[PDB]
């Protein structure tokens, strides 16, 4: 099924041609164009009052990366390196070393925000829900080096946004 978008021949009756000449001389579709914009000025604007008003999001939103931890206090990360092995941009660097207690934890877990693509592949690959993409997105920095995240900075993000991230995962883990 196809339709001819522009295959309309105009009628050549005296009334039709008089109307076409009137539209040409007395600009008619031009007045319609004016009227449409008049109708929308009288309409309500769509602008929101940022930063006092924020655009809507979803619990699945991908933002600032963060390392979570168990309710006991121990970090969830076990240095299985799935996130490092699955990152499309190779933005994660992990070095592991058996801790004094014996549990295997990262001696270095750096995520480079200037190289990250915010795909969320790491948070899917993680088998313990250790690394997540937090809800934060207003974390712009004045210098480049501040975007090269360390293990300590990611742990601070996890401890800061934990209230939001726990609820976000709680409202989405069933879909996964």
């Amino acid at each position: 099924t196809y339709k001819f978008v522009n295959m309309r021949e105009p009628s050549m009756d005296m009334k039709s041609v008089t109307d076409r000449a009137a539209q040409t001389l007395l600009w008619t579709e031009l007045v319609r164009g004016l009227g449409m914009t008049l109708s929308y000025l009288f309409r309500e604007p769509a602008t929101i009052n940022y930063p006092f008003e924020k655009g809507p999001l979803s619990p699945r939103f991908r933002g600032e990366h963060a390392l979570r931890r168990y309710p006991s206090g121990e970090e969830r990360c076990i240095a299985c390196k799935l996130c490092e092995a699955v990152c499309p941009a190779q933005a994660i660097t992990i070095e592991a070393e058996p801790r004094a207690d014996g549990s295997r934890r990262t001696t270095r877990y750096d995520i480079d925000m200037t190289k990250c693509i915010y795909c969320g592949f790491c948070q899917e690959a993680c088998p313990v829900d250790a690394i997540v993409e937090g809800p934060n997105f207003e974390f712009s920095t004045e210098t480049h080096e501040e975007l090269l995240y360390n293990k300590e900075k990611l742990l601070n993000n996890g401890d800061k946004w934990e209230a939001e991230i726990a609820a976000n995962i709680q409202a989405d883990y069933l879909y996964r």
Binding site: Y50, P51, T114, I117, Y118, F137
Partner: protein, 155 residues
Amino acid sequence: RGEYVVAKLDDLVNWARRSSLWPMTFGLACCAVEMMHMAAPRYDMDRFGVVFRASPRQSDVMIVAGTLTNKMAPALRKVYDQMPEPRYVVSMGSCANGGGYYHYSYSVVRGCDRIVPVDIYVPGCPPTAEALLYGILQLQRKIKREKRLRIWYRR
């Protein structure tokens, strides 16, 4: 006292600069689309005093939005040179920040900072238009904290 007078002059000049930041139409890649969406009715750059303007001669802030490649870097540096001072560079997106997805490619500049002095680093791939608006407001506060005439008084 002279310090108070130069202080007030600083506040006036900084307020003008921050309240009429005129950006440049230098969208490069997908990061430009969000650069358009904050110009879209929802976020509307215009209410914050920022109005898009080409012809670098009459613009202040450059939002490098998109991947900066080797073939384009001379053009970007030259165009940054055309901007009369004061000038500011806002880097949108991971590609313009440090390389992004194609950080290991053969024809991509590994960060816009290597070509121009970037003033605000906006992260994202692409950054949400809210995040870019936040970066612009951060630049606005930066201009607010300038101390030009104070330093001149303590030359």
